[PDB]
Amino acid sequence: ESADLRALAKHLYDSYIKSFPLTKAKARAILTGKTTDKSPFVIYDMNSLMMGEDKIKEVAIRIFQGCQFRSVEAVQEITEYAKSIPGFVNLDLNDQVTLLKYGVHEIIYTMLASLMNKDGVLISEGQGFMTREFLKSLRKPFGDFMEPKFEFAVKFNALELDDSDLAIFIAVIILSGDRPGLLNVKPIEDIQDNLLQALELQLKLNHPESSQLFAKLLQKMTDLRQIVTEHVQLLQVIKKTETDMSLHPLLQEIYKDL
Ligand SMILES: CCCCCCCCC(=O)O
């Protein structure tokens, strides 16, 4: 019923606020220059990066490892959020692991869009702002790492979704019954059905003007999956070229293998 869907929407949003310290509302307040929030230190070159360390191996590797640490933190936040989705903790333990293993990256890039604009990305809980041009200036293959994410974010941000919309969308992503190696797909699809229903009512009530936003949002999955596929290919290159560079155990378990 409609009231039950509104209740599910409210639960997920409340639960999202508790799991993710830097929301899209806080991120937009920082980027647009609002009084609810302070201005970030901008990193656009090597000098601002060095000063930035004071305010906030080689440069390219150091930045990459910084992104790897934030990814670990994000995985932790997503795992805590997943546990609050009704029915998730009641699923087979191997399926819970499988849903998180494949789901987190898709959620990482969805939530990364909230911290981005066409010019750059908010870093270290919004204290910093690293420019896109600087990240693109990095030596190969590191220069190519964030560019497809910026390309996705520009398109995704045009949908003008808020945190309450994103809370249900990332729940829908987690409960994907088409992940490889799942043992019981039906209770997963059963939860996703209710999540899809809650998302549809949320988008119709929150964005009444925005025609077919529901379909438009579900279409963004292809782009998300593609981002994930490309990202995986890029780490394989690094693994072979930078044999002294170590990847966090949590990330190693998620990445190998997809
Ligand atoms: C809680 C999900 C937030 C995504 C931000 C993680 C950024 C990861 C990266 O720089 O690649």
Ligand SMILES: CCCCCCCCC(=O)O
């Ligand atoms: C020397 C660290 C360079 C920072 C790379 C980006 C880190 C992302 C973050 O702090 O959220």
